[PDB]
Scaffold this motif. Structure first.
Motif, mmCIF file in Angstrom:
data_model
loop_
_atom_site.group_PDB
_atom_site.id
_atom_site.type_symbol
_atom_site.label_atom_id
_atom_site.label_comp_id
_atom_site.label_asym_id
_atom_site.label_seq_id
_atom_site.Cartn_x
_atom_site.Cartn_y
_atom_site.Cartn_z
ATOM 1 N N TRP A 39 0.659 -1.267 0.055
ATOM 2 C CA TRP A 39 0.031 0.031 -0.094
ATOM 3 C C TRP A 39 0.933 1.162 0.080
ATOM 4 N N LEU A 50 1.002 13.933 3.540
ATOM 5 C CA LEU A 50 1.602 13.276 4.678
ATOM 6 C C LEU A 50 2.627 14.393 5.410
ATOM 7 N N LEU A 52 5.083 15.866 4.672
ATOM 8 C CA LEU A 52 6.742 15.774 4.638
ATOM 9 C C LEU A 52 7.349 16.521 3.557
ATOM 10 N N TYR A 97 15.368 7.954 2.149
ATOM 11 C CA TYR A 97 14.445 9.042 2.928
ATOM 12 C C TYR A 97 14.331 8.455 4.292
ATOM 13 N N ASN A 98 14.084 7.217 4.386
ATOM 14 C CA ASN A 98 13.844 6.551 5.884
ATOM 15 C C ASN A 98 15.269 6.104 6.504
HETATM 16 C C1 LIG Z 1 -1.033 8.385 6.598
HETATM 17 C C2 LIG Z 1 -1.515 7.803 5.448
HETATM 18 O O1 LIG Z 1 -0.530 7.308 4.691
HETATM 19 C C3 LIG Z 1 -0.755 6.383 3.473
HETATM 20 C C4 LIG Z 1 -1.948 6.124 3.050
HETATM 21 C C5 LIG Z 1 -1.971 5.527 1.795
HETATM 22 C C6 LIG Z 1 -3.358 4.549 1.397
HETATM 23 C C7 LIG Z 1 -3.352 3.281 1.322
HETATM 24 C C8 LIG Z 1 -4.482 2.384 0.901
HETATM 25 N N1 LIG Z 1 -4.884 2.804 -0.164
HETATM 26 C C9 LIG Z 1 -6.256 2.326 -0.859
HETATM 27 C C10 LIG Z 1 -5.355 4.475 -0.133
HETATM 28 C C11 LIG Z 1 -3.988 5.216 0.061
HETATM 29 C C12 LIG Z 1 -0.924 5.231 1.280
HETATM 30 C C13 LIG Z 1 0.201 5.573 1.462
HETATM 31 C C14 LIG Z 1 0.423 6.164 2.606
HETATM 32 N N2 LIG Z 1 1.718 6.679 3.435
HETATM 33 C C15 LIG Z 1 2.858 6.639 2.912
HETATM 34 N N3 LIG Z 1 3.296 6.252 1.594
HETATM 35 C C16 LIG Z 1 4.406 6.224 1.196
HETATM 36 C C17 LIG Z 1 5.524 5.918 1.989
HETATM 37 C C18 LIG Z 1 5.282 6.364 3.374
HETATM 38 N N4 LIG Z 1 4.032 6.639 3.662
HETATM 39 N N5 LIG Z 1 6.310 6.566 4.273
HETATM 40 C C19 LIG Z 1 6.013 6.297 5.689
HETATM 41 C C20 LIG Z 1 5.815 7.894 6.461
HETATM 42 C C21 LIG Z 1 4.787 8.555 6.414
HETATM 43 C C22 LIG Z 1 4.689 9.565 7.180
HETATM 44 C C23 LIG Z 1 5.963 9.914 7.976
HETATM 45 C C24 LIG Z 1 7.059 9.278 8.022
HETATM 46 C C25 LIG Z 1 7.027 8.008 7.292
HETATM 47 C C26 LIG Z 1 7.429 6.946 3.792
HETATM 48 C C27 LIG Z 1 8.050 8.417 3.411
HETATM 49 C C28 LIG Z 1 7.237 8.965 2.591
HETATM 50 C C29 LIG Z 1 7.875 6.161 2.371
HETATM 51 O O2 LIG Z 1 8.944 6.076 2.109
HETATM 52 N N6 LIG Z 1 6.742 5.810 1.496
HETATM 53 C C30 LIG Z 1 7.193 5.113 0.235
#
Ligand SMILES: CCOc1cc(C2CCN(C)CC2)ccc1Nc1ncc2c(n1)N(Cc1ccccc1)[C@H](CC)C(=O)N2C
Length: 124
Positions: A39, A50, A52, A97-98
């Motif tokens: 996801w 987010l 960021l 990034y992480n």
């Molecule tokens: C808080 C909500 O977060 C998300 C929700 C959805 C939904 C998943 C279900 N789909 C049906 C709809 C979108 C998709 C993606 C995200 N979050 C998300 N996407 C990519 C990454 C990610 N987080 N994070 C984790 C993070 C988030 C906030 C603070 C620190 C680290 C990291 C940094 C962007 C990352 O590398 N990826 C690819």
């Protein structure tokens, strides 16, 4: 602001069907898409949603499986290596990034290991 997503369709690019490109869509993308860790990687990182503000200061070559799916299904790729490179960019962006041992990093590592098991069986 988020950047625009990567290019995914170009009518002027030549198009070919290969066993490898079909396998990358029908097997590799399908398998990773449906994984419980997929996801975060199914769409571009929305750094506005987010909160960021540094994401696109650090990540200058964004990539994600939504983009990879579009590139495969639009016959954007000529070489299988182009697709494999995009998967590698997506995993390395997460590692950049992480930080080592973060939950999202472990998720990316598990998806990369499964990617490699599937690429191992890339047809001739
Ligand atoms: C808080 C909500 O977060 C998300 C929700 C959805 C939904 C998943 C279900 N789909 C049906 C709809 C979108 C998709 C993606 C995200 N979050 C998300 N996407 C990519 C990454 C990610 N987080 N994070 C984790 C993070 C988030 C906030 C603070 C620190 C680290 C990291 C940094 C962007 C990352 O590398 N990826 C690819």
């Amino acid at each position: 602001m988020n950047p625009p997503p990567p290019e995914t369709s170009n009518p002027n690019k030549p198009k070919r069907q290969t066993n490898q490109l079909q396998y990358l869509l029908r097997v590799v993308l399908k398998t990773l898409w449906k994984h419980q860790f997929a996801w975060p990687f199914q769409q571009p990182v929305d750094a506005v949603k987010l909160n960021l503000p540094d994401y696109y200061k650090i990540i200058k070559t964004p990539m994600d499986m939504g983009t990879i799916k579009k590139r495969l299904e639009n016959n954007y790729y000529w070489n299988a290596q182009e697709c494999i490179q995009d998967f590698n960019t997506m995993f390395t962006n997460c590692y950049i990034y992480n930080k080592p041992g973060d939950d999202i990093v472990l998720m990316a590592e598990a998806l990369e290991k499964l990617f490699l098991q599937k690429i191992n069986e890339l047809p001739t």
